[PDB]
Ligand binder design. Sequence first.
Ligand code: HEM
Length: 184
Amino acid sequence: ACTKNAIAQTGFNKDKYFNGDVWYVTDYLDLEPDDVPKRYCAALAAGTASGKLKEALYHYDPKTQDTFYDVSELQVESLGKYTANFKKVDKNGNVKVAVTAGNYYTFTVMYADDSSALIHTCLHKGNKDLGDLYAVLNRNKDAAAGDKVKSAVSAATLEFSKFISTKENNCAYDNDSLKSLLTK
Ligand code: HEM
């Protein structure tokens, strides 16, 4: 179940966030913690491609080696708050699971600056969801969370100390695929 109406950053700068570059998940918190593994790798690219607002996602379970990419077209609900219907693709953008009704996620950018961000997502895959999932992002895959984003976590009435880090999982990412998937 998802339970939070995440508030987007006041003054969110969409063009900076959606600049075509990659964001790495460095830390995450699911309010239903058993919905996701305790060790995980994830990253995304976010950009406009030929006028269309896009995200490309990468997920990797470093223990099971379960790997998948997704491409999403985002619709705007309000500044910094989106609804994304996804298609599962291979790394080259070939469709494995087409877009469908019931497969979507909400995506809210709660905090962002040039190097860091705090997001919320609620994933729906038919009548299943993956709970309220918060993620701390950085442009540098190895960056420890700094005070701007940790303060944003606090401002969301969350505690950064409860977030699970992705840093001890030997995560390795194909940035080229993420960037190229924005066009697909
Ligand atoms: C950064 C933001 C994220 C977004 C927007 C997001 C989005 C999604 C989407 C769209 C899917 C479905 C993929 C498909 O079936 O084609 C998915 C699945 C999944 N995500 Fe995330 N995700 C994010 C971060 C994470 C993180 C950090 C974890 C942490 C553990 C995670 C764990 C999972 C798992 C375990 C699944 C598989 C669900 C199932 O098998 O049905 N995700 N995610």
